[PDB]
Amino acid sequence: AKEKNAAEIRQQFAMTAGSPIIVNDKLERYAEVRTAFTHPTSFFKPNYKGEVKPWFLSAYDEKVRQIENGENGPKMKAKNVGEARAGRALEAAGWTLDINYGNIYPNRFFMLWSGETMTNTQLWAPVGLDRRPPDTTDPVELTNYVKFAARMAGADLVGVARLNRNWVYSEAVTIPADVPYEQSLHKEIEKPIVFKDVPLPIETDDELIIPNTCENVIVAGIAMNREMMQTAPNSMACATTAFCYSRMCMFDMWLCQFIRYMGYYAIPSCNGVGQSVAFAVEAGLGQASRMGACITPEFGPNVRLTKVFTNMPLVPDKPIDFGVTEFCETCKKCARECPSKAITEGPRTFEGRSIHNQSGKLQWQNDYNKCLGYWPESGGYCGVCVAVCPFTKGNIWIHDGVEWLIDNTRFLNITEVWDGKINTYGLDADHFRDTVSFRKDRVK
């Protein structure tokens, strides 16, 4: 006659301890300014009138053009102008709790490295939870507590790894502390991230200082909505992306406060501080893939990541190998469907394709300037590679009577989305049992 079981799947494919990422001697920490979103070589893109602008402003011009022409995406006619409008209103509102598309500035706005000034900390100050020494130092108990809190805080997946500094940005993109929001985009700077023998995360005029005791990284997966992502590259894919960034932000703040009130310190990050995919792989959420994302058993790549760094003692999780690398070796669906041909069809190498790649680690090397170039053209955040990946299909797992396996057969419109199935936070009750959690699967 067997119903899907993520705990069994993860146990079946668990590896022995050790970072799965393969590196050589060319590896150096990566300056965040090099990402396509920020680097001068990629930052500017033409709009549909040929005017060269910051990429997100050129994308804005295309969003406005599509609404006026009753389109939900590039050459994709909406039911009417009102439907086109509704999709961009949903997208825009999803970003409500996110600063400048990613919350990357460390220790600014929502991403504070200390809780001292937050209104919640001030209200609770008489209890002294953030000043009382920890009552628990046992990593086993702390891992159970912090993972339970993580699920409360909106994570669909949570894992723990030792912090690998190779993936922490050599220098962050940030703004001076005295610069108000309305000037932030004009006053962005770089600032080194360094590790020193200090008791608490602290920021000087010159440096963002992470303590040498910052042992661990907690990684969260924030599930996006399948029906909406499958509209990629059209507006509804932008909306599930946007809403999950605000979920990421709430997660980080909730969890950091929990960790602080347990007597440790905690650094939030969302898209800042370090490379989420690498942390997620080392924390066992999933495997790296040809497109470059972390592919998870539960959601494929259709899941966002955030992470929190802490000195709280924790038990690292085991990495997972459910065969993604070998599937990506033969699949190439994302490479073939990518509207900008940004994804390589070749083998993995240690050699960066351009400045946006960190050389010295074995991965599929993609041209992320080509990817970013398609966003102003399509007026969105694309996501076609996520949408076409077979691992994004909700039912890829089958049980053969003995064990779990991937179904190889899987590798061979917006009005209906607005009118169709939805549930709280865009989660799907047909799959929400995938992420049920008991102590047995939080810590062994």
Ligand X SMILES: Oc1ccc(Br)cc1
340 binds ligand SF4 (CB under 6 A): yes
Q: State which of residues 18, 40, 50, 126 lies at the interface with ligand X (CB under 6 A).
A: 126
334 contributes a contact to ligand SF4 by CB under 6 A: yes
Where in 204-223 is the site for ligand SF4 (CB under 6 A)?
none
| Residue type for position 158 | V
Pick out residues in 388-407 that bind ligand SF4 (CB under 6 A).
Answer: 388-391
User: What token pair was written down for 72?
Assistant: 């939900």
58 or 358: whose CB is closer to ligand X? 58
What does the per-residue mask of binding to ligand X show for 312-341, with x meaning CB under 6 A? Answer: ------------------------------
381 binds ligand X per the rule CB under 6 A: yes
Residue 291's nearest CA partner among 302, 280, 306, 299 is 302
DSSP per-residue codes, 329-379 = HHH-HHHHH-TT--S--S--BSS-SSTTS-SSB-B----HHHHHHHHHHHT
Identity of the amino acid at 137: T
Nearer to its own copies by Cβ, of 206 and 419: the residue is 419
Is 15 buried (19+), middle (13-18) or exposed (0-12) by CB count in 10 A?
A: exposed
**44 touches 180 (CB < 8 A):** no
Q: Is 389 annotated as a binding residue?
A: yes
Binding region for ligand X (CB under 6 A) out of 64-72, 122-130, 204-212, 249-257: 122-130
Is 381 labelled a binding residue?
yes
Nearer to ligand SF4, 175 or 385 (CB): 385
Rounded to the nearest whole angstrom, what is the least distance from the CB of residue 22 to ligand X in the complex? 26
- Binding residue count for ligand X, defined by CB under 6 A: 9
Contact call for residue 241 and ligand X (CB under 6 A):
yes
Of 226, 234, 241, nearest in space to 413 by CA = 234
Phi and psi torsions of 312, nearest 5°: -55, 125
Spell out the long-range contacts of 422-429 with Cβ–Cβ below 8 A and sequence spacing 24 or more.
422/225, 425/154, 425/243, 425/247, 426/223, 426/224, 426/225, 426/228, 426/240, 426/243, 427/156, 427/223, 427/225, 428/225, 428/226, 428/394
Q: Which residues contact 82 (CB under 8 A, 6 or more apart)?
A: none
**What tokens were used for 358?**
């960190």
Strand positions, DSSP E, 226-333: 266-267, 287-288, 294-295, 303-310
Q: Which of residues 166-185 bind ligand X (CB under 6 A)?
A: 185
Look at residue 266 and give the partner it binds from its own copies, ligand X, ligand SF4, none, a contact being a CB closer than 5 to 8 Å depending on partner kind: none
Where does this chain touch ligand SF4 (CB under 6 A) — which range of 18-26, 112-120, 252-260, 327-335? 327-335
Give min distance, CB of 306 to ligand X, in A: 11
Cα 308 from Cα 216, distance rounded (Å)? 8
Flag whether 362 is marked binding.
Answer: yes
Phi, psi of 167 (to 5 degrees): -100, -5
Confirm or reject binding of residue 101 to ligand X (CB under 6 A). yes
Of 253, 303, 331, 406, the one binding ligand SF4 (CB under 6 A) is: 331
Judge whether 316 and 160 are in contact, CB under 8 Å: yes
Among 56, 54, 55, 75, residue whose Cα is nearest residue 65 = 75
For the CB of residue 372, give the shortest distance to ligand X in the complex, in Å: 9
Among 169, 243, 327, 404, binds ligand SF4 (CB under 6 A): 327
The reply to whether 70 sits in an annotated binding site is no
- For residue 66, give the H/E element and its range: helix 55-68
Q: Which of 292, 277, 302 is nearest to 159 (CA)?
A: 277
Nearest approach, Cβ of residue 209 and ligand X (Å): 27
Nearest distance, CB of residue 77 and ligand SF4, angstroms: 21
Binding-site member from 30, 113, 299, 374 for ligand SF4 (CB under 6 A) = 374
CB of 208 or CB of 223, closer to ligand SF4: 223
Query: What's the min distance (Å) between Cβ of 248 and its own copies?
Result: 12
CA dist 63 and 235 (Å) reads 9
Name the residue whose CB lies closest to ligand X.
Answer: 101
Interaction of residue 56 with ligand X, rule CB under 6 A: yes
Q: How many angstroms separate the CA atoms of 379 and 341, rounded?
A: 17
Q: Which does 241 bind (CB under 5 to 8 A by kind): its own copies, ligand X, ligand SF4, none?
A: ligand X
- Hey, what amino acid is at 189? I
Q: 211 vs 383, which CB is nearer to ligand X?
A: 383
Residue numbers in the known binding site are 36, 169, 271-276, 291-294, 303-305, 328, 331, 334, 338, 356-363, 371, 381-382, 385, 389
Residues lying near ligand SF4 in the complex (CB under 6 A): 289-291, 327-328, 331-334, 338-340, 342-343, 371, 374, 382-385, 388-391
Residues lying near ligand X in the complex (CB under 6 A): 56, 101-102, 123, 125-126, 185, 241, 381
Residue numbers in the known binding site for corrinoid are 36, 169, 271-276, 291-294, 303-305, 356-363, 381
